[PDB]
């Protein structure tokens, strides 16, 4: 009866969504022309999980009961910790680092991989002055958690043209590499064998630059970010992704949402079914935006809306689960897809 069984069969199941306790240290392997993430034994793995929103704004999700719910009730094997730099983030309020550290420890404690995301966004060039602390930040995390097999580093969320920015061309890609290579080098010199994920121009829509001009490191993957109200299967972003995957580039969806790219609108679930069917079929890991109760469709939790609803609390109790009615439409859908169960939405009639 579930509609996905006939139409989108790779949406059902989770046998490859292995936790650290089972998978151990990750690697990239070559399999039938593709470079894909695999576990310690060389068996394909898929990471599926959730991103925080900016930790300067929504740190409340960094609590053990929420992390346990995500790992156990939602079936996540990854969580992404989005540390803005600008916009009230680390450049002006460095105490957000403390929340990233806490989050790494809670991911480990709850048997998940963890992505540490230096969340470049405004402005768009990772080399900009505001981001000068990036190399020392990664240094510090690696000193605290040396060669830790749970951690994946994401050096620059979304290179993009916001001034001062990067261009959507080969010159823009060169600025990204010039940024990333010295950090990678430092991490490797320090003995860190972690997977490192590298963004690309146009808001991490251009993993295809790695076809002819990859970074020379066998544990680097390339991000692609999409939002299903904006970006459609067989559209620009999708085809750049597909072109990279086909050509053997290792690709990881570190951020996607069910809204427009603004974080709002919809959600657009029928389009999400098409993207996730492709990602699951092609062994591409994915992380959904975001673990917030802000009033925007991409947030996973019900928001405060005057006259309508109190916010769902991100600081969860000892039951280690949110009721489905406490999840937004997006969060309920994403939970279903992480777990690999049929999507069977609740009625929402106020
Ligand atoms: Ca807390
Ligand atoms: Ca984004």
Overall tally of domains: 1
> Strand order across the biggest sheet?
3-4-5-6-7-8-9-10
Total DSSP E strands: 10
Q: Into which percent range does the helicity of residues fall?
A: 25-40%
> What name is given to the CATH topology?
TIM Barrel
Bound molecules: calcium ion
Shape: globular
Strand content: 15-25%
Report the top-level CATH class.
Answer: Alpha Beta
The largest sheet, given as strand count, sense and whether it forms a barrel, is: 8 strands, parallel, barrel
Straight-line distance between termini: 28 Å
CATH superfamily: Glycosidases
List its traits.
350 residues, alpha/beta, TIM Barrel, 8-stranded parallel barrel, 11 helices, 10 strands, 31% helix, globular, binds calcium ion, cellulase
How are the secondary structure elements laid out?
Layout: H1 3-7, H2 20-23, E1 27-31, E2 34-38, E3 48-51, H3 64-73, E4 78-84, H4 96-109, E5 113-119, H5 134-144, E6 151-154, H6 170-189, E7 196-198, H7 201-204, H8 209-212, E8 220-227, H9 236-246, E9 251-257, H10 269-281, E10 286-289, H11 329-339
Parallel strand pairs: 3-4, 3-10, 4-5, 5-6, 6-7, 7-8, 8-9, 9-10
Antiparallel strand pairs: 1-2
Helix pairs in contact: 5-6
Bound molecules: calcium ion (CA) (2 copies).
Residues 62-63 line the site of one calcium ion.
């Amino acid at each position: 009866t579930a509609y996905e069984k006939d139409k989108y069969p790779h949406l059902i199941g989770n046998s490859l969504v292995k936790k650290p306790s089972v998978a151990g240290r990750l690697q990239i392997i070559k399999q039938n022309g593709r470079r894909i993430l695999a576990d310690q034994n060389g068996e394909p793995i898929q990471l599926r999980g959730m991103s925080t929103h900016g930790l300067q704004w929504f740190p409340q999700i960094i609590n053990n009961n929420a992390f346990a719910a995500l790992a156990n009730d939602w079936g996540c094997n990854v969580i992404r910790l989005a540390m803005y730099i600008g916009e009230g983030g680390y450049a002006t309020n460095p105490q957000v680092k403390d929340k990233v550290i806490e989050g790494i420890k809670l991911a480990i404690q709850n048997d998940m991989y963890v992505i540490v995301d230096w969340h470049v966004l405004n402005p768009g060039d990772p080399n900009a002055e505001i981001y000068k602390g990036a190399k020392d930040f990664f240094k510090e995390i690696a000193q605290k958690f040396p060669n830790d097999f749970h951690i994946i580093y994401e050096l620059c969320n979304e290179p993009n043209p916001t001034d001062p920015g990067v261009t959507n061309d080969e010159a823009g890609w060169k600025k990204v590499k010039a940024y990333a290579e010295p950090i990678i080098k430092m991490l490797r010199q320090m003995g860190n064998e972690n997977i490192i994920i590298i963004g690309s121009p146009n808001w991490s829509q251009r993993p295809d630059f790695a076809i002819k001009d990859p970074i020379a490191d066998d544990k680097v993957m390339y991000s692609v970010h999409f939002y299903t109200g904006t970006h459609k299967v067989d559209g620009y972003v999708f085809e750049n992704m597909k072109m990279a995957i086909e050509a053997g580039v290792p690709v990881f969806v570190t951020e996607w949402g069910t809204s427009e790219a603004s974080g709002d609108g919809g959600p657009y679930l029928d389009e999400a079914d098409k993207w996730l069917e492709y990602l699951n079929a092609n062994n591409i890991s994915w992380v959904n935006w975001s673990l917030t109760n802000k009033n925007e469709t991409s947030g996973a939790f019900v928001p405060y809306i005057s006259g309508v609803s109190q916010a769902t609390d991100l600081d969860l109790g000892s039951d280690q689960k949110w009721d489905i009615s406490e999840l937004s439409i997006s969060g309920e859908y994403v939970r279903s897809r992480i777990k690999g169960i049929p999507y069977q939405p609740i009625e929402r009639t106020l």
